[PDB]
Design a protein around this ligand. Structure first.
Ligand SMILES: [Ca+2]
Ligand SMILES: [Mg+2]
Ligand SMILES: [Mg+2]
Lengths: 403, 379
């Protein structure tokens, strides 16, 4: 019971039937040419080796027909006519079917080899050249803090040629595996217990967003069934579908699980535009990584606008020089000296406070929230020193912890 | 005479590295800066750093240049082993310089690879074992072997990856074209080199007495003539290794040729016929026409719009539509060539509106499919 699989059964039946028919036909031609024609008293004969017959029958099976060797007995020639009618159909159907069978084996098999000190993130759901290129362009963007997270895509498809190119251009830090988060063996191959997080992307342009959310909820369930403590971040297309995953036993927003509901967020951003007319644009530009890049054909308003799009929102620890300032002094100080727009702080449980009044002091090691052009800018709030840096005129000199 | 020494250096280099790996695997089984080096080497060969783009560009040039040096040495030689002091043979000096570069690149790729055992069994690692150690033995003796170095033709198969690391293949059809052509050409060139080795060396079990002195170019021609199943038999293999190689080649390469030629004919057939833009004459009015364009709608339109009972006015008609015109419509467009022009495109694209210079037209006429399934959808 060793041929357990239908493709492997078909492979062995093809190869053995083809080889045995070729070998027996070569033996028959070898008999005919070496024995000669009986009705010519065996005088008409041609001493081929078996191997010359075997070669000649492959050269005629394939319709190459060199004629370096050929049959000359009448029984040889009549056998070659019969052979041509049968074996052209055999060769011309065998070679394609073997090429299909040997072409069927999966390219992106195998498993993630977890390095000694690199964090990794598993990414799945809607994986395509578009979703992956927009994802990687932001996730790996130069304006982020330098962190050596690896990305591990897990998806059922073979990647298309454009996506294979993109995976090769990021070879050092992006890896791809054929599989599904619905299979515990595939979750082990990507070592999901050792990942920081799993990110589940959605096809925003599908025929049915309830069907797409039902698919993504079952991925969340499969991940959480495999191990409860994985941080899962999932893109949802419909708000009412969120309740179904809040009710998963092992879903916990306090452990960092989250559902990015694009319907909730969309309507929230445009609703704030009813309160402040352009605010959906102000605010949506803060949540995508982008670097300002002039081009001389831009009008003044386009350059002003585009410089504003170079901004993102960053979190960083305020230096000890901020301790016991009010939030208003800390915000005046960040804006005026550091060129950083400080707008909120994590007050130590702990709670986010946005633009808090003079009653709130900066406590030691307070995390602040800044609008700035890059993570390299906000570091200045962490390195600022009231003795060493306080007289500096140009912000590029604020550096190196001021020790 | 001495070829088994050139072959031995490729085998002992392969084997000793494989042994060091296997005993290391056993020691680490019975019992940081390494990862920083691995990532740096990986970024370098992936062309991610600027020095990586230099190294990647050098691999492209020197892989082509090494192959051209093989064509010279394969063209201008008779016996496959040949006596020649290295201080005299200029091609054998540049061949050494390229083999030193490929040795440095081999050690970089080793550093970069995740599993050293599987790395030592990659196809390009064999291309390196069968070429670099022989090229050093070609200094230690005053002779050369035109041996397994035909495998340099496989280094061309790196080109689609270089043209991916350099981000120049931006389109999936163009990626597929370059992968098809380079894989086909490199497989044909390497197969011709293998047949050239076999026929000119002769059968070893017949003491090399059975041999046939083909040029590399005769092998290259003969393999195309058998790939295509033409099989003139003006040239044919006669060594037993030659004939057994031709049997193996026929089973593989008929499927390659018979799938390559159709797929290239599809790719080169895909390019748009009615591209380009309307060249606005110095004093002729024109009208842009779009929406439902077909032989029926165009023939009824032109028969009235150009009718002899109208006043003589030299308006040109410019059809803009997404379809390739059918054979009957191509005929009608040619019969009106002086005054009717057609462009592939859509009025939904501002670039197509510019191509037909719609700002300079009198009018745009938008026709409708009166016989559609849904007239609200058509409107
Ligand atoms: Ca930025
Ligand atoms: Mg890695
Ligand atoms: Mg004209």
């Amino acid at each position: 019971n060793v041929l357990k699989t239908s493709t492997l059964i078909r492979l062995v039946q093809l190869v053995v039937s083809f080889v045995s028919l070729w070998l027996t036909a070569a033996g028959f031609l070898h008999l005919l040419e070496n024995s000669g024609d009986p009705f010519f008293d065996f005088g008409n004969a041609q001493h081929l080796t078996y191997w010359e017959c075997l070669y000649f029958l492959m050269v005629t099976m394939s319709t190459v027909g060199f004629g370096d060797i050929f049959a000359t007995t009448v029984l040889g020639r009549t056998f070659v006519v019969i052979f041509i009618m049968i074996f052209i159909g055999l060769f011309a159907s065998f070679i394609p079917e073997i090429a299909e069978i040997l072409g069927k084996r999966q390219k992106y098999g195998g498993s993630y080899k977890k390095e000694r000190g690199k964090r990794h993130v598993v990414v799945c759901g809607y994986i395509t050249f578009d979703s992956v290129s927009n994802f990687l362009k932001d996730f790996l963007h130069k304006d982020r803090e330098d962190v050596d997270v690896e990305i591990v895509f897990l998806h059922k498809g073979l990647p298309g040629l454009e996506l294979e190119g993109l995976l090769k251009r990021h070879f050092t830090q992006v890896e791809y595996f054929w599989g599904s988060v619905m299979d515990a063996n595939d979750l082990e191959r990507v070592k999901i217990q050792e990942a920081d997080a799993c990110l589940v992307l959605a096809n925003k342009y599908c025929q049915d967003p309830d069907q797409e959310d039902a698919a993504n909820i079952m991925r969340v369930i499969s991940i959480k069934n495999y191990h409860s403590d994985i941080k899962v971040i999932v893109q949802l297309l419909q708000y009412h579908n969120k309740a179904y995953l809040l009710n998963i036993p092992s879903w916990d927003w306090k452990r960092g699980d989250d559902a990015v509901c694009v319907a909730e967020l969309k309507l929230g951003f445009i609703a704030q535009s009813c309160l402040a007319p352009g605010f959906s644009t102000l605010m949506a530009n803060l949540f995508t990584m982008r670097s300002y890049k002039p081009t001389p054909e831009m009008s003044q308003w386009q350059t002003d606008y585009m410089r504003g799009t170079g901004m993102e929102m960053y979190t960083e620890y305020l230096s000890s020089a901020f301790n016991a300032l009010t939030f208003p002094e800390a915000a005046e100080l960040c804006f005026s000296k550091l060129k950083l727009l400080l707008l909120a702080i994590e007050v130590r449980e702990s709670t986010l406070a946005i633009n808090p009044g003079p009653k709130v002091k900066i406590e030691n090691a307070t995390q602040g929230f800044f609008i700035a052009e890059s993570a390299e800018e906000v570091k200045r709030a962490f390195y600022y020193c009231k003795n060493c840096h306080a007289n500096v005129s140009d912000v590029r000199q604020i550096k190196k912890c001021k020790c | 005479r001495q070829w088994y020494s050139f072959l031995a250096s490729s085998l002992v280099t392969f084997g000793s590295g494989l042994v060091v790996i296997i005993i290391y695997r056993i020691v680490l089984w019975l019992c940081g800066w390494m990862t920083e080096a691995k990532d740096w080497a990986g970024e370098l060969i992936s062309g991610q750093t600027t020095t990586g783009r230099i190294l990647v560009g050098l691999v492209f040039l020197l892989s082509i240049a090494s192959l051209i040096i093989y064509f010279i040495d394969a063209s201008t030689n008779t016996s496959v082993e040949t006596c020649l002091p290295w201080s005299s043979s200029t091609t054998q000096q540049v061949d050494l310089a390229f083999n030193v570069f490929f040795m440095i690149y081999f050690f970089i790729r080793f550093v970069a690879a995740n599993d050293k055992l599987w790395f030592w069994v990659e196809l390009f690692s064999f291309v390196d074992y069968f070429t670099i150690p022989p090229s050093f033995v070609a200094i230690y003796l005053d002779r050369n072997w035109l041996g397994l170095r035909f495998l340099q033709a496989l280094r061309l198969m790196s080109i689609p990856d270089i043209l991916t690391y350099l981000n120049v293949l931006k389109t999936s059809t163009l990626i597929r074209l370059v992968q098809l052509v380079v894989s086909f050409v490199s497989l044909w060139l390497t197969a011709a080199g293998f047949l050239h080795l076999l026929e000119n060396s002769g059968d070893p079990f017949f003491d090399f007495g059975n041999a046939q002195h083909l040029t590399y170019w005769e092998c290259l021609y003969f393999l195309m003539v058998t790939m295509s199943t033409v099989g003139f038999g003006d040239i044919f293999a006669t060594t037993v290794l030659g004939r057994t190689f031709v049997v193996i080649f026929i089973m593989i390469f008929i499927g390659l040729f018979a799938s390559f030629i159709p797929e290239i004919a599809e790719i080169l057939g895909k390019r748009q016929k009615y591209g380009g833009s309307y060249k606005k004459e110095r004093g002729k009015r024109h009208v842009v026409v779009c929406g439902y364009i077909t032989f029926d709608s165009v023939s009824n339109f032109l028969k009235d719009f150009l009718h002899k009972d109208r006043e003589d006015v030299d308006v040109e008609i410019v059809f803009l539509h997404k379809g390739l015109p059918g054979l009957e419509l191509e005929g009608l467009l040619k019969r009106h060539f002086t005054q009717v022009e057609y462009f592939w495109g859509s009025v939904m694209d501002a670039n197509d509106l510019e191509r037909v210079k719609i700002q300079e037209a009198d009018a745009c006429l938008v026709l409708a499919n009166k016989y559609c399934q849904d007239p609200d959808q058509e409107d």
